[PDB]
Amino acid sequence: MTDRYSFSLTTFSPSGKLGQIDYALTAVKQGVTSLGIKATNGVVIATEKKSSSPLAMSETLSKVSLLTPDIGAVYSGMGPDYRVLVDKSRKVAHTSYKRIYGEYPPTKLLVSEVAKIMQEATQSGGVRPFGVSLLIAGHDEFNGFSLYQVDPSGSYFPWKATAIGKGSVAAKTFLEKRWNDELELEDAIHIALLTLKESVEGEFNGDTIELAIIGDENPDKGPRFRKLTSQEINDRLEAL
Amino acid sequence: GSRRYDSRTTIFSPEGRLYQVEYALESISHAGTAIGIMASDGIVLAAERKVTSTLLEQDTSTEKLYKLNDKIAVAVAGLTADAEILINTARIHAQNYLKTYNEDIPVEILVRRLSDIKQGYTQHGGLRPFGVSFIYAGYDDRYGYQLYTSNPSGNYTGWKAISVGANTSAAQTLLQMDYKDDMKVDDAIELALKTLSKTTDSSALTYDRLEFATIRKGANDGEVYQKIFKPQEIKDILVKTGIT
Amino acid sequence: GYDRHITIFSPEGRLYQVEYAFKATNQTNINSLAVRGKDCTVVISQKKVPDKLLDPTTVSYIFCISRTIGMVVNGPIPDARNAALRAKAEAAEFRYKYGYDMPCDVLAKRMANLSQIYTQRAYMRPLGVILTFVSVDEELGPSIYKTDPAGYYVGYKATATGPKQQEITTNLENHFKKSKIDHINEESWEKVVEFAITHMIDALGTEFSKNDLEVGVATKDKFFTLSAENIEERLVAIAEQ
Amino acid sequence: TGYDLSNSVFSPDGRNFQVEYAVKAVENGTTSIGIKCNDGVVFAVEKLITSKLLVPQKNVKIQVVDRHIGCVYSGLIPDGRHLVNRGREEAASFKKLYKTPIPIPAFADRLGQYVQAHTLYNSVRPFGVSTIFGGVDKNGAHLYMLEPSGSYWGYKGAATGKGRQSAKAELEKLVDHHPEGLSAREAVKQAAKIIYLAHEDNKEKDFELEISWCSLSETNGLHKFVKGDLLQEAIDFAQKEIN
Amino acid sequence: TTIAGVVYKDGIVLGADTRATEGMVVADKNCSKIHFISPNIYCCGAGTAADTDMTTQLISSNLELHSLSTGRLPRVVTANRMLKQMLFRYQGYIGAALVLGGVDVTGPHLYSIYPHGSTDKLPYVTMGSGSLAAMAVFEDKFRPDMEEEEAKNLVSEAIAAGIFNDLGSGGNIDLCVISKNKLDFLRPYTVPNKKGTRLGRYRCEKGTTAVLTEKITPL
Amino acid sequence: SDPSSINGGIVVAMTGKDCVAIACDLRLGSQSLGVSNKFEKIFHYGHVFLGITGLATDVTTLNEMFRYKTNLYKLKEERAIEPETFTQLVSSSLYERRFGPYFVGPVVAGINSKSGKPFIAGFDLIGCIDEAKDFIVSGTASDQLFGMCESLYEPNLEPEDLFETISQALLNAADRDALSGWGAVVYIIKKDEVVKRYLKMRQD
Amino acid sequence: TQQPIVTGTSVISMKYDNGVIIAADNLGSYGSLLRFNGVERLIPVGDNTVVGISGDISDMQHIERLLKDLVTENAYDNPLADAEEALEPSYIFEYLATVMYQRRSKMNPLWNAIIVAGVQSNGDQFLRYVNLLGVTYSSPTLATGFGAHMANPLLRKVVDRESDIPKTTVQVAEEAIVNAMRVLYYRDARSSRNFSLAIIDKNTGLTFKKNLQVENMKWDFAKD
Amino acid sequence: TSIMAVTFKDGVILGADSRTTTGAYIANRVTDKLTRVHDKIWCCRSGSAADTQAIADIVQYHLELYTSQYGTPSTETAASVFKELCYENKDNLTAGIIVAGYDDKNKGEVYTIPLGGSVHKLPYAIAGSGSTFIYGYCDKNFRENMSKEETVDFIKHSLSQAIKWDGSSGGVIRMVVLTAAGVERLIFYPDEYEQL
Numbered sequence A: 001m002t003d004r005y006s007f008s009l010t011t012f013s014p015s016g017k018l019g020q021i022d023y024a025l026t027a028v029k030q031g032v033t034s035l036g037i038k039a040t041n042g043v044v045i046a047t048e049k050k051s052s053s054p055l056a057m058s059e060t061l062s063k064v065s066l067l068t069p070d071i072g073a074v075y076s077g078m079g080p081d082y083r084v085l086v087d088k089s090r091k092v093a094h095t096s097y098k099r100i101y102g103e104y105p106p107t108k109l110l111v112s113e114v115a116k117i118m119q120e121a122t123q124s125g126g127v128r129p130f131g132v133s134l135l136i137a138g139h140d141e142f143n144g145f146s147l148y149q150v151d152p153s154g155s156y157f158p159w160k161a162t163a164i165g166k167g168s169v170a171a172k173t174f175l176e177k178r179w180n181d182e183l184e185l186e187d188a189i190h191i192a193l194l195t196l197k198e199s200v201e202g203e204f205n206g207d208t209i210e211l212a213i214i215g216d217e218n219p220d221k222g223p224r225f226r227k228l229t230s231q232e233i234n235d236r237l238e239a240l
Numbered sequence B: 001g002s003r004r005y006d007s008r009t010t011i012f013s014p015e016g017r018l019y020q021v022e023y024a025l026e027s028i029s030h031a032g033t034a035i036g037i038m039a040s041d042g043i044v045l046a047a048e049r050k051v052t053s054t055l056l057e058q059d060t061s062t063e064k065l066y067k068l069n070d071k072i073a074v075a076v077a078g079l080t081a082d083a084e085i086l087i088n089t090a091r092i093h094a095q096n097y098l099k100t101y102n103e104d105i106p107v108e109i110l111v112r113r114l115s116d117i118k119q120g121y122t123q124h125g126g127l128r129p130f131g132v133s134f135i136y137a138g139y140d141d142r143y144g145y146q147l148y149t150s151n152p153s154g155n156y157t158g159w160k161a162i163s164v165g166a167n168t169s170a171a172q173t174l175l176q177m178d179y180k181d182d183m184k185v186d187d188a189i190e191l192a193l194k195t196l197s198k199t200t201d202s203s204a205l206t207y208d209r210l211e212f213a214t215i216r217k218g219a220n221d222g223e224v225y226q227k228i229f230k231p232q233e234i235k236d237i238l239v240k241t242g243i244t
Numbered sequence C: 001g002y003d004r005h006i007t008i009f010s011p012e013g014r015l016y017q018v019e020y021a022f023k024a025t026n027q028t029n030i031n032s033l034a035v036r037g038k039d040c041t042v043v044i045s046q047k048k049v050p051d052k053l054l055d056p057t058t059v060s061y062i063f064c065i066s067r068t069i070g071m072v073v074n075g076p077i078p079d080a081r082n083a084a085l086r087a088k089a090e091a092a093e094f095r096y097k098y099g100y101d102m103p104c105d106v107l108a109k110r111m112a113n114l115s116q117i118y119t120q121r122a123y124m125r126p127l128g129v130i131l132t133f134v135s136v137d138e139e140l141g142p143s144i145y146k147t148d149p150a151g152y153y154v155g156y157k158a159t160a161t162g163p164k165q166q167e168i169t170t171n172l173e174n175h176f177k178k179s180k181i182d183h184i185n186e187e188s189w190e191k192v193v194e195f196a197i198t199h200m201i202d203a204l205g206t207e208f209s210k211n212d213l214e215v216g217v218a219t220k221d222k223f224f225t226l227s228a229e230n231i232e233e234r235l236v237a238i239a240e241q
Numbered sequence D: 001t002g003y004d005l006s007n008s009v010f011s012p013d014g015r016n017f018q019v020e021y022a023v024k025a026v027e028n029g030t031t032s033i034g035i036k037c038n039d040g041v042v043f044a045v046e047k048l049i050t051s052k053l054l055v056p057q058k059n060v061k062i063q064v065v066d067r068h069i070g071c072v073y074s075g076l077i078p079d080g081r082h083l084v085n086r087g088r089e090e091a092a093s094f095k096k097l098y099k100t101p102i103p104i105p106a107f108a109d110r111l112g113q114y115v116q117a118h119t120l121y122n123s124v125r126p127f128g129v130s131t132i133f134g135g136v137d138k139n140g141a142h143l144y145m146l147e148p149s150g151s152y153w154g155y156k157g158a159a160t161g162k163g164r165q166s167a168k169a170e171l172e173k174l175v176d177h178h179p180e181g182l183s184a185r186e187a188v189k190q191a192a193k194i195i196y197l198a199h200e201d202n203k204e205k206d207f208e209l210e211i212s213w214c215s216l217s218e219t220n221g222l223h224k225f226v227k228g229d230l231l232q233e234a235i236d237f238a239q240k241e242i243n
Numbered sequence E: 001t002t003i004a005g006v007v008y009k010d011g012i013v014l015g016a017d018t019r020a021t022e023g024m025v026v027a028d029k030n031c032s033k034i035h036f037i038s039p040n041i042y043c044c045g046a047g048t049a050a051d052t053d054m055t056t057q058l059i060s061s062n063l064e065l066h067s068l069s070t071g072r073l074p075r076v077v078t079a080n081r082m083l084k085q086m087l088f089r090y091q092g093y094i095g096a097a098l099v100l101g102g103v104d105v106t107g108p109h110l111y112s113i114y115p116h117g118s119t120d121k122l123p124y125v126t127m128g129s130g131s132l133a134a135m136a137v138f139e140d141k142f143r144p145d146m147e148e149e150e151a152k153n154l155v156s157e158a159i160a161a162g163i164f165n166d167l168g169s170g171g172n173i174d175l176c177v178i179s180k181n182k183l184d185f186l187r188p189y190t191v192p193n194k195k196g197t198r199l200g201r202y203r204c205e206k207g208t209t210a211v212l213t214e215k216i217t218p219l
Numbered sequence F: 001s002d003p004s005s006i007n008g009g010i011v012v013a014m015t016g017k018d019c020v021a022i023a024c025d026l027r028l029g030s031q032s033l034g035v036s037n038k039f040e041k042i043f044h045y046g047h048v049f050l051g052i053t054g055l056a057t058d059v060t061t062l063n064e065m066f067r068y069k070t071n072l073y074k075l076k077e078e079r080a081i082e083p084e085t086f087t088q089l090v091s092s093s094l095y096e097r098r099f100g101p102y103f104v105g106p107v108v109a110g111i112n113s114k115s116g117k118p119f120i121a122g123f124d125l126i127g128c129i130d131e132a133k134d135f136i137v138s139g140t141a142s143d144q145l146f147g148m149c150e151s152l153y154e155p156n157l158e159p160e161d162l163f164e165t166i167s168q169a170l171l172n173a174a175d176r177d178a179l180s181g182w183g184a185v186v187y188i189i190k191k192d193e194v195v196k197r198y199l200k201m202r203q204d
Numbered sequence G: 001t002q003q004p005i006v007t008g009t010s011v012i013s014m015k016y017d018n019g020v021i022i023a024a025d026n027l028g029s030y031g032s033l034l035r036f037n038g039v040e041r042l043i044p045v046g047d048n049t050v051v052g053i054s055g056d057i058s059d060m061q062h063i064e065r066l067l068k069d070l071v072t073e074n075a076y077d078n079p080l081a082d083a084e085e086a087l088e089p090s091y092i093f094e095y096l097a098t099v100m101y102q103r104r105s106k107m108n109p110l111w112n113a114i115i116v117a118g119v120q121s122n123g124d125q126f127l128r129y130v131n132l133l134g135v136t137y138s139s140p141t142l143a144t145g146f147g148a149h150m151a152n153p154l155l156r157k158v159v160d161r162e163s164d165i166p167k168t169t170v171q172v173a174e175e176a177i178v179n180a181m182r183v184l185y186y187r188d189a190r191s192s193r194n195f196s197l198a199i200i201d202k203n204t205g206l207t208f209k210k211n212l213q214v215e216n217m218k219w220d221f222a223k224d
Numbered sequence H: 001t002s003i004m005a006v007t008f009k010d011g012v013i014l015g016a017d018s019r020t021t022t023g024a025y026i027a028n029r030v031t032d033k034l035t036r037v038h039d040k041i042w043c044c045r046s047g048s049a050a051d052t053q054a055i056a057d058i059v060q061y062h063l064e065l066y067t068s069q070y071g072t073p074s075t076e077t078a079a080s081v082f083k084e085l086c087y088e089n090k091d092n093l094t095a096g097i098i099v100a101g102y103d104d105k106n107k108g109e110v111y112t113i114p115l116g117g118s119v120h121k122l123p124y125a126i127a128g129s130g131s132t133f134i135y136g137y138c139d140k141n142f143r144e145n146m147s148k149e150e151t152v153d154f155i156k157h158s159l160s161q162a163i164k165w166d167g168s169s170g171g172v173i174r175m176v177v178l179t180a181a182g183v184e185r186l187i188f189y190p191d192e193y194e195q196l
């Protein structure tokens, strides 16, 4: 055993394309639809719990993850890749930030750290890029509420609302029509449930949908991240 | 073994070119145009964002113009992630120099350092080069206002006005036609926007598709001030110059 | 076409080595099944000893990882033992560092994160195995968690693995559609094992002797495998009703 | 295609062709066998006499690990020696920490994990040997056989090399005709016969028989080579059975 | 310092004084000696204060990451192990003397952790320069399975013993009550000493100090 | 021999009503020998002020180090660091040299720009935070300052009342210490103006 | 650098016409405490060598394992392990000597004095000393620690130079050794009555004698 | 500290006092110095509490991992792992450990590991500061193949005396009985053992 892959597996092709990044983006395209919407008093992130079998307990598989008490993440693409990014995101939020400054990182900086990790898989020796795009929603004291997208390249962009994966082109058009700068959090949740219904084939309820919010503090502070329960989603589906 | 899969990123072609550098430059040619224009009383950085949707949150967005210290800024063309790696390295080098000499880093020294890092990826290590070209806008008390560019090869050069990214051929002709040595910042602002307005692949140049910045000594008591323009301010300067 | 030899993306966004590792999974031609009782988790697996020269006592794909955790493997034995040794080592290190027995799901996630590394790093190949972990967890109760070569993992009410997994899965799906509960409503593990065997017989359409099966049982504070005679007693009870 | 050019690459089948090619080197080698008896194990090997210049009884093939384990292999002889060297390091580190000599199943997995490790990377070649080994521990006798893939199982009888099918058939007769078990001295005689019968597949050149054994009664649970009168008695028994 | 803990019927009561000293001088009369490890586990700190602070923080941080990955509340044994194995590694040079108390899935647990990496699991413990004063109160009055308000009083009484009789201890009494149903962080629980009242005003009037030069800069 | 008292000198900080004050002497010596009477011990990073007493090479080194760190902080965060955050940064930085520490006694002072709350803090040489509202003292005449501050101080002072309190605390403490004095500086810090005053004191 | 904790006292030995004798008491002292009364300090290696060890008992047990391990290792790929390529006293000694000096040179000694007694392939008597400093020497009589002061004077009256070795029978040599062990028991405060004795003869081979005792003890003059 | 392990007919019993002192201050008067490294392999700890705890945790780990791979370890194997740690790290440890365990094959076994890192297999072993006072008593009163009740009394009387004379020892006498029947914990309070 010598890890002899000390050379890049992502290289520029004659056209200027980085093949493996493009192919990672193709893997993200095949993944299940997830979306994010930013309100004035909160952010909502949502996705479909595409259950691999009905015998599987889909509650155990969390697509929406808490990164810090005020920052949450959802994805489209390869689940195992997402899982190890969440692990590294949580850790870097402590090592390079909380243990130094005594507070959690702001959304943009944690996003930047994740983006850095993804970039390194795009240039380091003997690795493929991550096959996920992340949607990171969060709040911090000086920047307020924010929503970011992070791609396999390591590029990140802030969004008012967006979607990634399967039906993202259709979902983004849907959001463009519905979004305004005076949405309350409940209005954004309502729009998220509408937008997500279009891309979902089968059952559409609280057990097959995962949906979380960055909002008010839930009782030093309380955490702003909150994952909606199966019941809480179903209640809003009756007013749909 | 592994040799089978090795692209060999650090070799010469038979013509004496570095394949990956050339192909990275091809990558950069498709990136949004960035322009730097140096006047007698300040520098202008202007750059065009790309793809953009109505849903992109522009006021919290930074893909083109980055700050290295209080005296030096860069405009980016290429992979934004690659640039941010190099930017954080440059930001450290500036602070290491400040800590060592108790003076702000001279612009050329920082530029050489970054350009030397880029060079290293072309000569050893077997890794792909950084798919980034920088325009460095900066000031120091030796040479005053300075514009530089670096590219994936690690070569850097100084400029009075320059473009990187898309349509540089067209952009550089238009700059070469309307630039003059006695020019001022307000005039250079206008030239930069007029150049982007003509070379853009979009139908029209609007505030939401632009990042804009100025390095003026034009401040009270002869001190250098960096101004990264806000979305509303870019919209105002577009109306002032008569583009919208 | 070197995108099919190492773990890098094909143009479709696919890792062919991961997919081919999944195919190595069925190379043994063995079917496993796992179900949960009230107090227990039962895992059964086919046992095939094709050579008469083999010592049948050493032919096993069930592993005692810790006292509480059992692991059945669907896949070739060298990779199974690779995974078994690591899982044992991880479970022991966990108890030492954190002062309590490694939970079933925590181990499953740990082994899954290791499996993920082989799909991203080029020098390491994936293991050609699917690992089904079972325990009676002291917080979560009866637990079934499964890991694969992709690095995916998930908890199960019940599961099945192997060439005829779909038949066993649908057989189990149909039973839980009737009972409308996540488990076998039974007090004794002996009867949960009888259920497991019965529902494999129905799904696969094959009768079993005592040497054709291999059974693992997780209870509170121990996981154990049944002997041939313990299985024979189990088979007698099935036949008698 | 190209899936067979690099070790640790899954073909579209789910196979590692380089390992299967290593098996061909094993199949090319001389015949080696193992027989589990009542209170021990017997190992025997076919040594092809390439020339008259080979010194008799000198080029020993069977190797001892610790004091209680015997190893024999067919295929690339140096690869077998490399594996036994490792086995000796494993058996030494085990005894150093845990005091007791390494158990046979424990030892088997130590070789197993190491051989399997050589199918995980392209920078190494798989082992070109099937290794038959075993001995007597606290839980009694154990015979194992370990393939290039890392696969190993416990055996009543084992055989590998060019004459393996011939040998396996003979071993299967012994398993059927002796359910109550075979004695250590019987197993030595039977081992000699089976190597002699399996020599029909390598019949061009004549050969030299080499036998070893661990037995709780006959050798105090230690690995010893069958020498002198007992070796000649086994050769005579084998020569009688072919005629 | 005087820090103590008791195991009562429903859970754990931790206690601490509030005096931080440099040599013989009091630098802070109201400092927090009860640290957060996890939502169900707290740690009283004595010995070298820096070591006490950064050891609890590091283990709290690592337990947070552990708890995110496992998805369940962390245990007191794991907090205990992580502290223990670190302190042991550093062979007493990290001068952290902790009283670790919390409530698990497995019930309430109380530990004393020493700088060298030994731990005792006990129904009541005391540490710091006021440990003997506090332990006297526990030996006098402790009994197993106390009610909450009784245990609160016993710990408060034990911290008071340290405050008055030990010179290293002083200020207010902080408690932390941990049970399955709640966490009560009482700071301050008691103020046994009033701040001394000053009889004169010694503050100088404006223009009394002699200035050489002045500069004003706005922000 | 004792590194904390080779060069000498003192820092004191106080809170008032919508203001903080931080003050230091100007002496640098080699024990008995006075060398410089222009060695200021108070620095600032944005609106956060840091006094540092102790071994002068470490005072200088830490100033340069926190300038470095707060500069990168500002570039990345796109805002100046706050006193509460900086205090944690100082603590971290000191404790990462736990077994080869900087021989210093730092003092943070500033007003939180968002909340408007006046903030001060002190540290031992390995970064344990003294987090007191009233006052923080440091240096070779720390005992003297503790006594002066405890008797002179009272809460919620107006900026120019507070000036007289901190100045008299510094001056009278310094005059009872051989290794402090040779001049003094007092910063009066408000939410959006800072007044720096040099004090006239005995030059022995 | 350490300090010896549980210790063994004198190992004594001599050459005679056909071989060597070596002896050592069965005590593991713990300072002044006579802690362990069943410690064997003569450790045979094959059928031609006995290594007698004094000093730290934990370091002795380590050396005991190194020798046990040396036998195993010599047997590997060695068809003549019980014949021409068996371990010799001189091989066993040189190994130990190398180890002892290497350990002293890393400032981490095995805290022992060792006597390797045996008979070589060609019938020659082997008797050589090595200690924690790597110092080596041979002599017709060898003794460690206390025995060097009391046993050697008695044993040298039997074999005073090389030319006396062929004149000394096994009976005379064994008597002298057992006599010397008695003298040591009277006078060494850290010795015991119970000892082991090993004769390595070129004809009769290795004879290992356990549970011997010092007898014929003159105390009667005490009563006066 | 006063600790001892004693083999008898049905297996082995470990015994210990419960006092842990910091100088003259009794830091813990109800210490459990009998610690479990496997189901029926326990140890008595004396010396540095930090060191003997650290060792015992490492041993427990090694035997857990041994068990995962090779089944139940012998008492000898456990003693060998203790020894290896104690001997190799002798310069940085102060640990005097008695290891005691019950196999079905070997029955009761006692191994003592003193400061040096040497191992000694014995019918019974005594250790700790209080052991000095009972060498005379234990040597005179120990017999092999005692009954359970005789061995409980032998340990109770012995540690009673060790406690009486040694100030470093005291509190309750804990015992742990290891037989085929299982593991039994016993405790004996001052009012019982002081009047012996």
Ligand SMILES: *[C@@H](CS(C)(=O)=O)[C@H](Cc1ccc(CN)cc1)NC(=O)[C@H](COC)NC(=O)[C@H](CC(C)C)NC(=O)c1cnc(C)s1
Pocket: E001, E002, E019, E020, E021, E022, E023, E027, E031, E032, E033, E045, E046, E047, E048, E049, E050, E052, E053, E127, E128, E129, E130, E168, F123, F124, F125, F126, F128, F129, F130
């Ligand atoms: C009491 C401990 S005692 C005397 O051993 O009973 C307190 C405990 C404590 C715990 C937490 C905090 C807040 N994080 C504060 C106090 N410890 C102290 O008072 C310790 C000294 O105990 C021996 N004091 C210090 O550590 C002080 C620093 C504070 C005053 C900020 N350090 C020094 O005085 C030093 C001098 N030289 C050093 C090196 S440390």
Ligand SMILES: [Cl-]
Pocket: C109, C110, C113, C114
């Ligand atoms: Cl992990």
Ligand SMILES: [Mg+2]
Pocket: C006, C007, C017, C118, C119, C120, C121, C122, C123, C124, C125, C126
């Ligand atoms: Mg791979």
Ligand SMILES: [Mg+2]
Pocket: F174, F175, F176, F177, F178, F179, F180, F181, F182, F204
């Ligand atoms: Mg003065």
Ligand SMILES: [Mg+2]
Pocket: F034, F203, F204
């Ligand atoms: Mg003076």
Ligand SMILES: [Mg+2]
Pocket: H163, H164, H165, H166, H167, H168, H169, H170
């Ligand atoms: Mg006593």
